[model samples]
Target: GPHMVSSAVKCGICRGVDGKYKCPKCGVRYCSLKCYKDAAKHVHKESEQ
Candidate 1:
């Protein structure tokens, strides 16, 4: 699932380095601030669990 990919997946935009920030909305992870902010482009549920 996407949750498992959070730490393994790289930034969806830069596609460099493993993602550090997991989107609260979609569970997609980003490596940096810009990528995190840009996560809105992909939509999903936002929650802690």
Candidate 2:
């Protein structure tokens, strides 16, 4: 089962208040479209789990 929200998670890009989106490939939490684009610029590739 998926985990429930315990506390607000920080954004992977700016480390801002809270993340509103999650990357499908890397699962990185981000706050907005700006951060999403920034993340896409340098976001790492998916790793073996």
Candidate 3:
């Protein structure tokens, strides 16, 4: 329970809606180039915000 991520946080990539993570090859959860790059570029800085 302590390790769980809060739902209030936004997706690190889109920074809105909800957070979504996926595998980097299948295109399902994270199975595409776009999905892979999306997570790679995601940023969530509490201090910056």
**1 against 2, candidate with superior TM-score:** 2
lDDT of 1 by residue, 1-49 (tens): 4556433667665678777777665667678777766635544445655
Look at candidate 3 and give me any clashing residue pairs: 22-29, 22-30, 23-30, 26-31, 27-31
Best by lDDT: 2
Q: Is candidate 1 or candidate 3 better by lDDT?
A: 1
How well does candidate 3 match the true structure in TM-score terms? 0.26
**Model 3 CA deviation exceeding 4 Å by range:** 1-8, 22-35, 39-49
- The local distance difference test score of each candidate is 0.66, 0.74, 0.44
* Tens digit of per-residue lDDT, candidate 3, span 1-49: 5986675434444454444565434323432345456544633233655
Mind giving the per-residue lDDT tens digits that candidate 2 earns over 1-40? Answer: 7687666787878887588888786688888777887734
Q: Top TM-score: which candidate number? A: 2
Identify the superior model by TM-score, candidate 1 or candidate 3.
1
| Per-candidate total of colliding backbone pairs | 0, 0, 5
